[PDB]
Structure 1
Amino acid sequence: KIEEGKLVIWINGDKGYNGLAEVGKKFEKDTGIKVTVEHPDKLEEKFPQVAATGDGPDIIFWAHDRFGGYAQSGLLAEITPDKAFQDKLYPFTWDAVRYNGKLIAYPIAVEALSLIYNKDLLPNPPKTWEEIPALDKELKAKGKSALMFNLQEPYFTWPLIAADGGYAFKYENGKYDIKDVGVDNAGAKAGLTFLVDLIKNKHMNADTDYSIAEAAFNKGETAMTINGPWAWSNIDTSKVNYGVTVLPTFKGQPSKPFVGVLSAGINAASPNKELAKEFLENYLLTDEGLEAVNKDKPLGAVALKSYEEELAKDPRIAATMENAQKGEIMPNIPQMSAFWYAVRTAVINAASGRQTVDEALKDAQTGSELYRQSLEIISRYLREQATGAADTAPMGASGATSRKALETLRRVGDGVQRNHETAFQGMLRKLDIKNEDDVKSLSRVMIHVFSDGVTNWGRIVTLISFGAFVAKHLKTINQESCIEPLAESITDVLVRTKRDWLVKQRGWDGFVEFFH
């Protein structure tokens, strides 16, 4: 499917893709291998769709947070650089691209949002978010505004949501508690309510997106913006006398931007893996390769120690690293995609008045917890049905929901299996199962049959009950190790294809209510 003898690269439209194409031309000069750089729209959503069919680019560039989901789906080649190459990059950047103990991408650069201000309009930028309404009123008297930034991508609003205590997945004792989501706590609510109040008081407009905020800052209409290092090139061209500084505090606490490490992963379906490794290690991740990209659109604090020693002297890079140290390195867990979609919907709905801050963040919490809660219920049902004994481990966060959904699932699911016993036994024969490969083919049939019909709790219970019927067969045929991957496969198609409907039902609470 992917053509051998060439390299196709995907990178976001806000990065230095013309600089990257200059590195590709240098590679072609030596090897005769043509390198095509593309920047398709929504490349981070297109990549898992096309790479799953054996298609897509040879190399994908994105911040490290999406890569764990790609790796979990088997879409990325494991990268194994030698120690001499590994030592040329900062160890924390390699940590950002490690998933299940394996390196799944090459780190390129460390990105963090900073406060960018027009020194000619605002010689002393604000230290707090609280003083921005009064500053906006003062600036409005002169035909200017205090601040405009992209309100359509939650990445830009997150530093404010996290400032007073909001968090994505709790991190404590050197580990993430995936069961602990903090998008709907008092801290997140205060941050988002402050943003909504800025919009209600006409200090910001809910429709402001990336282009609008960028045009207004680069034309001197707004005194401040919130953006990353890639934006500096267009501000340079505009000749605005700008500064790059620490984000304002909220309730006396620093804004905490989610820090991304721009990384390059190699498609598992690529027949050009050795060419991609040579391109990335020996052409791109060199002082000259990174300089070519950086001159087009700044990368931020690069992962390559030798080049970073020079960039670190730039006060804009010092400000980027200061904001990064006050924030957090993004997790790379597979549910980051679901978290981002949920928080993106929450900020847009709260900003537009479609939902209150409380309704918006409650839905964001349900969406962010959906995979873990669904896995807990489905995994426990399949394993207790197969072995005849329940899991003694504590249910954890939202244990009441899990326990009640499991009790409901025992009552309804058992009835489904009892009434359709002969029909399920017949289907189990056609799907000849005796090993791990036979479970993977069953999964493919499940995904299509479930995805084809109507969305309702009856069909969801059928999908899970048939999975329990199969897990019983796996226990007797001494293939009990296939049960947990089957539970993960059922959970994945359920949370991915029925995401919106699930959240509208208040997740598993709606299931308990429906069958009450």
Structure 2
Amino acid sequence: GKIEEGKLVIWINGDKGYNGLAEVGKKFEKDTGIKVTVEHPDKLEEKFPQVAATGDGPDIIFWAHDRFGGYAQSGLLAEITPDKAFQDKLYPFTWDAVRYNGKLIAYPIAVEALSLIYNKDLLPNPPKTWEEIPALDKELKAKGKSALMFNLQEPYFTWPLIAADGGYAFKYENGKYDIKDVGVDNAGAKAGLTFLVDLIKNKHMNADTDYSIAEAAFNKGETAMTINGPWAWSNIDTSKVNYGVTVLPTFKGQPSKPFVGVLSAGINAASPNKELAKEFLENYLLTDEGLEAVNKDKPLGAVALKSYEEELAKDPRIAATMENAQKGEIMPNIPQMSAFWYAVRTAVINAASGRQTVDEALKDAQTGSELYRQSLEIISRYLREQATGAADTAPMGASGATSRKALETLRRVGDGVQRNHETAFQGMLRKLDIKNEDDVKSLSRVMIHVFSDGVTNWGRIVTLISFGAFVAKHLKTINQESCIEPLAESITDVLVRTKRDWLVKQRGWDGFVEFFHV
């Protein structure tokens, strides 16, 4: 459970230029005598936060920037402190992608956007609209071909169509995300996902098509079109297909809006090799020579390094990548992105398979995407009003009727539990001996052990939160009132992470209000 000193272990996704990255490793070894091991484990973006939490895992993790804010919030990433001269070598917007709470938490590498990739021997002119693809598939089926195949197992690839007519993740306005405002189950998201489920119903696409199936069908010339990123171009070059890379089709006359990723390199907070990792990333990888070694293996897209991006900018495939990037949006890096992606992944798979309707599927995705913020609103307000004797005057905001009725229910059932179990609550309080901000952060491991060692039901959830309020009254008492909000975030995190699937099957806090209805 300790990262070894005097080497570098690196994790990067299996679709990226990991052999190219290993050659940059070898150059580092030649100068320093330090061995660089590059690994591409399956589901590395799920494995990282698990292994890093115990002070294990790689020295360096590569992913798109969207996952890095959760990593940072959980204390898993070393702060990045490049000097000016090095910061000035990368585009300022790429540094913005790896800024979390005013601190740089990664090195940006490259800008990725999806494009439409078409076979010019099947489709001299690619379609400008999604709406013309059914008619084009009918023409191509008559010659033993299909119009379009892309990965339907990862919401990344379907999001551009969902977003086109007004689906969104977290509303962005006046240079600010409203994390309360989620656009997964609106009329625009519904129209985009209904169009996708209609293509599958009409046998223009297959619900089971994944990355490998779509890639093989395009690269063998069986399908005229795919949707993929720059990393995919190497294998198409090898297939000798006469391909173009172009703007994604419009939907209802509006651009497809890809979620734009910055491939980023983070340093593990538990690494004893932080100076070696900084030296490797700044003076070996993020050079014209280091990025070229990776790019030549699998293309990176529009690199963060200004000197190299100027050389690659002339490539029409890159110009097309940035066209689809500027019609799209830079992904948020807020901790909730992980939950957003899980929720939308399940909705797309379930709608495509017929397991749920589009309305049922996006309903559950909206509930899943809102769950952390709504749970924190309820739990934070209950802890603080129990501590101080006075309620919060601030509007509840989005889904406010549910937050209000959940807080009302919690006051009734929670107060009942605190009273009937006052002796048991006092006994556990003294036994924990909670004195400061440090002791509060150690409760997280105890909460997970006890709250997860039992049945899932609303009764045990009321106990988690009610004991939370009991501790909050104590923290007010000992002039540790500034610990109540951190405590509320820790309780919320334990609840939503461990009971995510059960909470969504109950329709979240509406199920809570219903279950305890008098």
TM class, shorter-length? over 0.9
The separation in 2 between residues aligned to 1:395 and 1:175, in whole angstroms, is 19
Structure 1 residue 341, shift from structure 2 partner: 0.3
Deviation (angstroms), 1:397: 0.4
Q: Deviation per CA, 1:203-237: give whole Å up to 9, x if none.
A: 00000000000000000000000000000000000
For the 8 Å contact 2:130–2:249, the answer to whether it is kept is yes
Cα pair 2:5 2:272 within 8 Å, conserved: yes
1:448 CA drift (Å): 1.1
**Matches of 1:202 and 1:348 in 2, distance apart?**
16
1:490 equivalent in structure 2: 491
Deviations 1:439-473 (A, max 9, x none): 12223211210011110000000000000000000
Q: Structure 2: how far apart are the matches of 1:433 and 1:160?
A: 50
What SS does structure 2 have at the residue aligned with 1:124?
coil
User: What residue is the counterpart of 1:447 in the other structure?
Assistant: 448
Report the RMSD for the aligned CA atoms in angstroms.
0.4
Q: Secondary structure at the match of 2:8?
A: strand
Residue 308 (str. 1) matches residue 295 (str. 2): no
Larger CA deviation: 49-58 vs 424-433: 424-433
- Which residue in the other structure is 1:190 paired with? 191
Q: Distance in 1 between the 2:96 and 2:457 partners?
A: 41
Report the Cα distance in structure 2 between the residues aligned to 1:417 and 1:229, rounded to whole angstroms: 57
Work out the CA distance in 1 between the residues paired with 2:263 and 2:328.
Answer: 16
- Would you say the 8 A contact 2:111–2:303 is kept in 1? yes
1:434 CA displacement: 1.2
1:36-77: CA deviations, max 9, x gaps?
000000000000000000000000000000000000000000
Query: Tell me, what secondary structure is at the counterpart of 1:120?
Result: coil
Q: Could you list the per-position Cα deviations for residues 150-170 of structure 1 after superposition, in whole angstroms to 9, with x for gaps in the alignment? A: 000000000000000000000
Distance 1:387 1:22 in 2: 60
Distance 1:233 1:99 in 2: 33
Which position in structure 2 is the counterpart of 1:242? 243
- Mapped to 1, the partners of 2:417 and 2:448 lie a distance apart of 19
**2:180 aligns to what SS in structure 1?**
strand
Unaligned runs of at least 5 residues, structure 2: none
SS at 1:214's partner residue?
helix
The alignment partner of 1:36 has SS state of strand
- State the alpha-carbon separation in 2 of the partners of residues 259 and 153 from structure 1: 15
Mapped partners of 2:435, 2:494: distance in 1:
23
Instruction: Give the aligned partner of residue 213 of structure 2.
Output: 212
Q: Distance in 1 between matches of 2:440 and 2:327?
A: 46
- Aligned-partner Cα distance in 2 for 1:81–1:201: 53
For each residue in 1:276-299, what CA deviation from the matched residue of structure 2 results, as whole angstroms up to 9, or x when unmatched?
A: 000000000000000000000000
Q: TM-score, normalized by length of structure 2?
A: 0.99
Residue equivalent to 1:91:
92
* 1:8-36 per-position Cα deviation (integer Å, ceiling 9, x unaligned): 00000000000000000000000010000
Say whether the 8 Å CA contact 2:11–2:61 is kept in structure 1: yes
Structure 1 stretch displaced more, 428-437 or 394-403: 428-437
Residues 162 and 190 in structure 2, CA contact (< 8 A), matched pair in contact too: yes
Maintained 8 Å contact 2:98/2:107: yes
Corresponding position of 2:32: 31
| Contact 2:396–2:404 (CA under 8 A) maintained in structure 1 | yes
The residue matched to 1:4 in structure 2 has which SS?
Answer: coil
Separation in 1, partners of 2:371, 2:356:
20
C-alpha distance in 2, partners of 1:250/1:330? 21
Q: Equivalent residue of 2:317, what SS?
A: helix
Q: How far off its partner does 1:438 sit?
A: 1.4
Aligned to 1:153: 154
Aligned length: 516
Kindly provide the CA deviation profile for residues 362-408 of structure 1, in whole angstroms up to 9, marking residues without a partner as x: 00000000000000000000000000110111100010000000000
Q: Does 1:337 align with 2:338?
A: yes
Q: Distance in 2 between matches of 1:380 and 1:352?
A: 40
Give the structure 2 partner of residue 357 of structure 1: 358
Between the aligned partners of 2:249 and 2:111, the Cα distance in structure 1 is 21
Three-state SS of the structure 2 residue aligned to 1:498 is helix
Task: Write the mapping of 1:382-393 to structure 2, written as runs, cut at 5 A.
Answer: 382-393=383-394
Which deviates more from structure 2 when the two are superposed, residues 431-440 or residues 305-314? 431-440
- Residue 250 of structure 1: CA displacement? 0.0
| Alpha-carbon offset, residue 433 of structure 1 | 1.3
1:437 is displaced (CA, Å) by 1.1
How far apart in 1 are the matches of 2:39 and 2:443?
36
Inter-partner Cα distance in structure 2 for 1:447 and 1:405: 23
Deviation at residue 89 of structure 1 after TM alignment: 0.3
- Distance in 1, matches of 2:328 and 2:63, equals 19
Give the conservation status (yes or no) of the 8 Å contact 2:249–2:255: yes
The corresponding residue for 1:472 is: 473
Offset of 1:193 from its aligned partner? 0.1
Question: How many Å separate the matches in 1 of 2:129 and 2:431?
Answer: 66
d(CA) in 1 for partners of 2:213 and 2:458? 43
| Distance in 2 (alpha carbons) for counterparts of 1:351 and 1:443 | 38
Give me the identity figure in percent. Answer: 100
Quick one: distance in 1 between partners of 2:375 and 2:208? 34
Which residue is equivalent to 2:401?
400
Name the SS of the counterpart of 2:41 in structure 1: coil
* 1:476-513 Cα deviation digits (max 9, x unpaired): 10000000000000000100010000000000000000
437-446 or 55-64: bigger deviation: 437-446
In structure 1, C-alpha distance between the alignment counterparts of 2:461 and 2:192, rounded to whole Å: 36
Aligned-residue offset at 1:436: 1.0
- Looking at structure 1, the residues matched to 239 and 441 of structure 2 have their Cα atoms a distance apart, in angstroms, of 55
Q: Secondary structure at the match of 1:79?
A: coil
2:264 corresponds to which residue?
Answer: 263
Question: Any conservation in 1 of the 2:444–2:494 contact (CA below 8 Å)?
Answer: no
| Secondary structure at the counterpart of residue 82 of structure 2 | coil
Instruction: Please give the alpha-carbon distance, in whole angstroms, between the structure 2 residues aligned to 1:486 and 1:349.
Output: 36
Farther-moved stretch of structure 1 (178-187 vs 447-456)? 447-456
- 3-state SS, counterpart of residue 244 of structure 2: strand
Aligned equivalents of 1:54, 1:474: Cα separation in 2 = 30
Cα distance in 1 for residues equivalent to 2:153 and 2:444? 36
